[PDB]
Design a protein around this ligand. Structure first.
Ligand SMILES: [Cl-]
Ligand SMILES: [Cl-]
Ligand SMILES: [Cl-]
Ligand SMILES: [Cl-]
Ligand SMILES: [Mg+2]
Ligand SMILES: [Mg+2]
Ligand SMILES: [Mg+2]
Ligand SMILES: [Mg+2]
Ligand code: NA
Ligand code: NA
Ligand code: NA
Ligand SMILES: [Zn+2]
Lengths: 243, 242
């Protein structure tokens, strides 16, 4: 076990998106854990991982990397911590926030709500409609956006305004744009693993194509990456690697 | 003739943000045999359930979460209203756009997230962001007292929007509350004023100017009594309904 690590994205890879892991998947993972170390990484925060993977998540995985590894647990205890304001500084943080606030104020939408800017440890989540919107409101924006390309234009303008300042901008989900320091995608968690001496770090994700949130870690030479369709696919591949 | 005892929750029926004691809940059910009872609070239905019990709608003749924007009578849901329906989506968005642009032009030591929190009865607007840490709240609060950041913001909001039927009030250490005129606790009185009660007694702990019971207390449709704690509420009710 100790020589290799199977590192899994959570949403769409270990669980159905935003849903609790199944008892079958949980049983499979602990059996797999007898043959390899296992870890989980995702953009969601620790409390969301607890809700989906169990309150005892840090005991069920050898590594737990909420927020792409900006928060990190090894063997049930916290590793070092970093956050966006500590890396970027308050001036750049405020420039980013001010630009996004002013930009959103000039977008004409059917509806606006609240939580246009969600401040997290490893990123800002920015939404023209507001992340507190209801499901009916979220789908309405999503369908409008696929026609008007509001988020695509926003991302392009952000890249122009902040070129060279060390930030990455990405379309996220149905209503948001993710703003984060370059390299603070899932690859960040590799910082906690690359010197541990594992013979192989396998990675499994469901969004490995360009623009997806597994793409960079999937293509990173430090991992042996696999694309999965759903948790059943993850099991099938893992059974082949660790019979 | 028929009377109604209408209670604020936090600090009146319970300790602030805490579950009702078994003592008070038992007293209320006895009192209910002599007068109708109801509860009103700014918190949402699920918070009332957390503090007053998941069966709250069956233990009170009236339940008014969110100041009565949601209303229950005799265990049944009556009707609902929200800020976007009352103002219309265009005005909501004009208000939100103005606040976002304004906040972007305030120079602060730190900005965080949740500058606009959207609720069905109000917006909570914060130049620093409602997600900020406790240390950051104090830093902003103290800076604001010297620089008058929220006072200037509220003045500009009143100038731009008050004709849309909105009230703006400084709230807590970091926020500005934005809500339609009369959407304080008085809102729930529309569900009661034509019922034919001889007296609507009201009980609350924040009945002075600035407190969230002040307007409903001073409204002529209620006979208000100020309480210092749940035990004081029980004392007064026992005198009114021996
Ligand atoms: Cl993710
Ligand atoms: Cl209240
Ligand atoms: Cl916001
Ligand atoms: Cl009094
Ligand atoms: Mg995924
Ligand atoms: Mg690779
Ligand atoms: Mg009170
Ligand atoms: Mg009165
Ligand atoms: Na969270
Ligand atoms: Na007026
Ligand atoms: Na007054
Ligand atoms: Zn109604």
């Amino acid at each position: 076990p100790m020589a290799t690590l199977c590192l899994f994205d959570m949403d769409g890879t270990l669980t159905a998106p935003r849903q609790k892991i199944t008892e079958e998947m949980d049983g499979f993972l602990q059996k797999l854990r007898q043959k390899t170390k296992i870890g989980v990484v995702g953009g969601s925060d620790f409390e969301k991982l607890q809700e989906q993977l169990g309150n005892d998540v840090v005991e069920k995985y050898d590594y737990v990397f909420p927020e792409n590894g900006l928060v990190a647990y090894k063997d049930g205890k916290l590793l070092c911590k970093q956050n966006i304001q500590g890396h970027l500084g308050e001036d750049v943080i405020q420039d980013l926030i001010n630009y996004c606030l002013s930009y959103i104020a000039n977008i004409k939408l059917p509806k606006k709500r609240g939580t246009f800017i969600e401040f997290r440890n490893g990123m800002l989540n920015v939404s023209p409609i507001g992340r507190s919107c209801s499901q009916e409101e979220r789908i309405e924006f999503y369908e409008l956006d696929k026609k008007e390309h509001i988020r695509q234009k926003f991302v392009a303008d952000l890249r122009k305004e902040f070129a060279g300042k060390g930030l990455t901008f990405s379309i996220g989900g149905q209503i948001s744009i993710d703003v984060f320091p370059e390299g603070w995608d899932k690859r960040y968690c590799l910082r906690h693993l690359e010197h541990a001496g594992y013979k192989t770090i396998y990675f499994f994700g469901d969004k490995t194509m360009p623009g997806g949130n597994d793409h960079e870690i999937f293509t990173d030479p430090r991992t042996v990456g696999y694309t999965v369709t759903a948790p059943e696919d993850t099991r099938r591949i893992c059974e082949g690697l660790f019979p």
